[PDB]
Amino acid sequence: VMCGGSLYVKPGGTSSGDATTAYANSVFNICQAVTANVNALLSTDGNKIADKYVRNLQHRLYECLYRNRDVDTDFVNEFYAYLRKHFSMMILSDDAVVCFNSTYASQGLVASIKNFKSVLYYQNNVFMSEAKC
């Protein structure tokens, strides 16, 4: 990087002015959202779940995450459909709006703010203060 009049070494992170900033930011945003939903669903107690289909989902999700080794298209499909029904999203580059079920969220079947805070902490190295959400 030619800051000032000398060359330094950029450690990491994006350089906002390249050929594809807004789109890669959108991709990264969706990634964090999905990661938070996954952590939310996996970090909840199973016995407290009422619906049989939802346990089935959580059980087989743990399967497809750690036990399995390669892709399983049908699981991905039905989970993506589940997310599209309980967590609709609107994404412009790093700027999101979420319309989500409220009782599911209360029970812990989708992600609320706290999950985003935890995810950002251990995967982004920042602390998202709750005065901005």
Place this chain on the structure above:
Amino acid sequence: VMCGGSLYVKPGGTSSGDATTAYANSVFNICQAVTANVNALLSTDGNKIADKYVRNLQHRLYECLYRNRDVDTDFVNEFYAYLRKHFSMMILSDDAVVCFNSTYASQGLVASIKNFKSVLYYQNNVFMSEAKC
């Protein structure tokens, strides 16, 4: 009581030879069964209940037991119907057989053996050993 050749004083309990033994025993049996069901339903945590109608039942049961003061025919009716659907009984004098839901029992919405043991302990002054149930 003219045992031996002298008169003593009977402290309590039935004299199994009067004019109406088997029927009064049947009544007392049904009483203990209903008491056990009531203790079972009231001694269970509310938040763990899944169905809304059942939390309504438990809530209003506590109402009609302690908060209220006189009878409420509709509550009695619908609770009696509830029992007739998830507890079905066959009573000869002090000798019963029960055909009951199993998953409700597991969750704690009807009475299992343990509730009978507790009820007999504090309301009959005996310890019902589980080798006879």
